[model samples]
Target chain A: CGLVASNLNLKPGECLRVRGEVAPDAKSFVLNLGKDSNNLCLHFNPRFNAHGDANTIVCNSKDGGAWGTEQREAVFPFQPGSVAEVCITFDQANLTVKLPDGYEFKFPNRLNLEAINYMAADGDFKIKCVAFD
Target chain B: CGLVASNLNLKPGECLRVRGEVAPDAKSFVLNLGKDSNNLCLHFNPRFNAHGDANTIVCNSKDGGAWGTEQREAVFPFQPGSVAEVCITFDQANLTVKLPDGYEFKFPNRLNLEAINYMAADGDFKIKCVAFD
Candidate 1:
């Protein structure tokens, strides 16, 4: 019950950079890039202390109401009640990511598509700005 | 001696992304961000055909009258006959970049600064777009 945004034209070699604040009592949030919720190429989820000490970042892709293999990273760079910034670069077969800690990671593009037309974000986080470059 | 860019507030959470076409027969070009030319924080250069078949990317920082250790990457992602997109995100001690090939790299902030307020581009390339997020 937070937010869902769209009308974004994200292509290969392009990036989506977002600036936001992690809610102190936030449970979790998701940033999705794709045609719609049912067909997402990049699904970025950061769990803020979710499930009793499971502070991890999970990535997955959804296609046609079905989801792909879930890719999870153990490094949680988010701090509650703090501002976080992240940038995601879309590639042909992968999506490169920059976390708030300035570190980088990569995820497989299981959706296997080029040029996502929309992007949506929802959950307990408050996004200040979303920029495409 | 074709371009120079600056005047951007590129901080830890900020990014500078540029969309440009590699000039046909372009020798080389540079994208710089920092206070001024002499005190640059990030110097991004791609040589299409520089120094006799040296197709390389050179990154560096100039503090005062001296330059720091040069960092060179052999992978050149720009094609002289097509368009290219790149995104650079400034971190505390380094800057992470998303090259046109959708690959990622990191360069040190040798100037040791918090924010860069100026950006300049000078080269044989033509820019289609530059956006900050």
Candidate 2:
């Protein structure tokens, strides 16, 4: 089963750092940051040939069950069965994602939330650590 | 549900740091560091009133599904609905736990293993972050 962590009280200024390994047969993995599952402020998904996407990083937001426009980054820095580190920071305007290869991707904060208290990760990713700084 | 993180490559010198909030109606909470659930090197449990104990911290080890002698620490620094920080480091001899109040508790490494790969938390604690340093 995937990991779900709640009661985080993550404010805008704080950074969420995650370190994990991509599964050997991984087709995709997603990290969701939100007030709850229904109101995601950031939907960070990396695809290794899933949903007709290959070696791509997709970012989006969901509010009240409706997903916003998708943002795709083609400079994928991930590989199957390899360790990956990601750092995410956000404010009321946008979310900045720092990938494992030191590349940064910025996506709009469509939900515009002040704080997020819930986080969930799913798919073929094995999480080693999740921290805030 | 409580949080469980596996596939952690925690070595002898690395520190496992956890920050979380005690549940408002928490009676107790336990953090287990182990190769798996059956062979725990350290079991750090805090009680507010449960299992015939109150306002105390208990440390123990489990080897092959059998629990060793229990060691108790009375210097409890946790309160209901408040955040707490704990750092754990282990060697071949002992596992050292630095509590929220800055008091250090040491328990024997009965398993005496080189690394631990599983961590689990149960009862009424809400984890904010779990990381290795």
Candidate 3:
């Protein structure tokens, strides 16, 4: 049980921040927002499976299509009990992800945000808390 | 100081992998690929300033625009010495990132592949190794 926002008039020159925890036994989880589920998403599925206990994560969207144009990844591989954060920026023409200590993944503008304010972290991943600022 | 690929011609219904380490004392790093630098990048800059020692990271892009449409973030806030990997999938119009055991971030289709291939890990963050397959 948490907060879910939708019908957001997100434009080309905008960005959003997502902060949350990946459930202790969560095998998988997805944070969905934007216009459509296929248009954009925040995804995860370990290579060896369950890299950590609890993961704090961030996902950003700014493009104008069904698939994302950019992204970045960072995790406390060894330590599974903590929080994670990622800052996503939309330059109207470029998508940039800034991590603490300076790690980034950049992508281009894709879909148009037309009342596009739909976000949720789904799939076995236990969400301790989720917030957007 | 890494291996780079070009003219990949990536498309929908496909996936790419990125694995690397973020510099210890670095401020920001970008993984450049899929046609242009502005199209997608991996970035970092601690919110509280240098959250940890270093970060292992990954990034994926699949949209067809200038501003990205999907992304995610996971970090070892308390522990900073590890490797990060993000598996990106292009479901024709949707992009999915699967973490180990499964933490997910999703986005929609945004770009059309046109010999789209270029990648780099930039910034002050030290990169011990980078591999994509």
Candidate 4:
């Protein structure tokens, strides 16, 4: 139902690649990168029809259980029941994401931590792989 | 950490490839292919020094919470703190595994099920990827 990785030791310039299939009836899914669950530096969420949003990609940050401003993108290239690949690269200032359809987006690094040790995926996504290098 | 996947619908002739890194202090880790947690069809375990076994690969099956006889292999190709790739393919009769070092082994398909929908990894393995084709 979900995927979690801990003690990742992910550093700047490293790429985190995630490949998975979106569920047919999925409303939304989220991938979080951070120090832990409550202190996420990057929260990447794609909504098919959840949170009053449709086919929208939302990026935000959470610090000490509080959320920051949400950045929304109108691009929608994902189809239900199809495999999607996402690659993320980050530094101390920002996180860059490349979506399946070749579109790229960026969000500022709010926490500005040195390394990321925890990552998690939630919602209706079935992860096939998570790799970092 | 651990990894789990459900509703995989893995069929005969399909290959399940697992890529991961073994913990530096890991004694052992397990990969299970099954209908669920309690009804594993293939229990692939590699021991560094656990359960009175040292640098051994042990394979088994669990049916309705009971374990079948263990099949042990003397060829240990795994090393601590290193990445390992394992490829598994199965039919109704047997399951074949290819280790990171290119060594091959087989275990009987004791459950004889048509498809495998659930998979899990436990102990000190940090999964980088789990893919099926």
Per-prediction fnat values?
0.00, 0.31, 0.00, 0.24
Write the residue-wise lDDT of candidate 1 on A8-50 in tens digits.
Answer: 5567898778777888888888788788779998889988766
Q: Per-candidate interface C-alpha RMSD? A: 12.9, 4.9, 19.1, 4.5
Best by lDDT: 4
Q: Clash totals for all models, in order? A: 18, 0, 94, 0
Scored by lDDT, model 4 comes in at: 0.86
Instruction: Name the 10 consecutive residues with the lowest summed lDDT in model 4 chain A.
Output: A1-10
Model 3 per-residue lDDT tens digits across residues A24-83: 554545545455445553322222143343343434453444444324345534123344
Q: Lowest summed-lDDT stretch of 10 residues in model 3 chain A?
A: A41-50
- TM-score per candidate, chains pooled: 0.49, 0.61, 0.34, 0.66
**lDDT (Cα) of model 2:** 0.85
- Model 3 per-residue lDDT tens digits across residues B1-133: 3333333344454455554454444444554545555564322222213335244333345334455432435552312344555455555455565666556655544554443344444443333322223
Which sections of candidate 3 miss by over 4 Å? A1-133, B1-3, B41-79, B114-116, B124-133
Q: In candidate 4, how many clashes are counted? A: 0
Give me the displacement of residue A67 in model 4, in angstroms: 1.3
Q: Supply the global lDDT for candidate 1.
A: 0.74
Q: What level of docking quality does candidate 3 show? A: incorrect
> Which model scores highest in DockQ?
4
Chain A TM-scores, candidates in order: 0.91, 0.95, 0.53, 0.95
Question: How many clashing pairs does model 1 include?
Answer: 18
- Per-candidate interface DockQ score: 0.02, 0.22, 0.01, 0.23
